[PDB]
Design a protein around this ligand. Structure first.
Ligand SMILES: [Zn+2]
Length: 165
């Protein structure tokens, strides 16, 4: 319930703070992702013009990790027999960011980028958002090669949204 459609492209309005499904306004979502925080949105009831306001911003490193992890978590929860909450930096997160780049940013990708080298320190400095695992747990049969691994501290995905005030 909660008036939420998790896994859909949802947008939160910065004025009334309520949640909306983008396509109910006919907003084009071909380059949108569920669990974005890099936008500002006003619904048509709140906005002075009586139309929607949808400002798309360029995702910073933290937003890319967060959206990647939210999406990976969601897919796993709803599609995996045995859902994972911890994901491989190299096998999961980077490939997600690569695949869905254009839904997060309009920056071109000339030559080799530096962002891959920097997401680990991005997540590691925000352990109130991100769970970090450099190595498998003592006793774990987890292959060392998939580490380090990352996850969301908060598993309530409904909590993800833009940093309004
Ligand atoms: Zn509103």
């Amino acid at each position: 319930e909660n008036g939420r459609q998790l896994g859909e492209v949802e947008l939160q309005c910065g004025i009334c703070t309520k949640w909306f499904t983008a396509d109910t306004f006919g907003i084009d979502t071909s380059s949108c992702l569920p669990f974005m925080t890099n936008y500002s949105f006003h619904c048509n009831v709140c906005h002075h013009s009586g139309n929607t306001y949808f400002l798309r911003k360029q995702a910073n490193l933290k937003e890319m990790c967060l959206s990647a992890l939210a999406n990976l978590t969601w897919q796993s929860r709803t599609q995996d027999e045995h859902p994972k909450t911890m994901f491989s930096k190299d096998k999961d997160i980077i490939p997600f960011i690569d695949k869905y780049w254009e839904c997060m940013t309009t920056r071109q990708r000339p030559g080799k980028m530096t962002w891959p080298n920097n997401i680990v320190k991005t997540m590691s400095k925000e352990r109130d958002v991100f769970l970090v695992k450099e190595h498998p747990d003592p006793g774990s049969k987890d292959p060392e090669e998939d580490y380090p691994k990352f996850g969301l501290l908060d598993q309530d995905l409904s909590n993800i949204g833009p940093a309004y005030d």
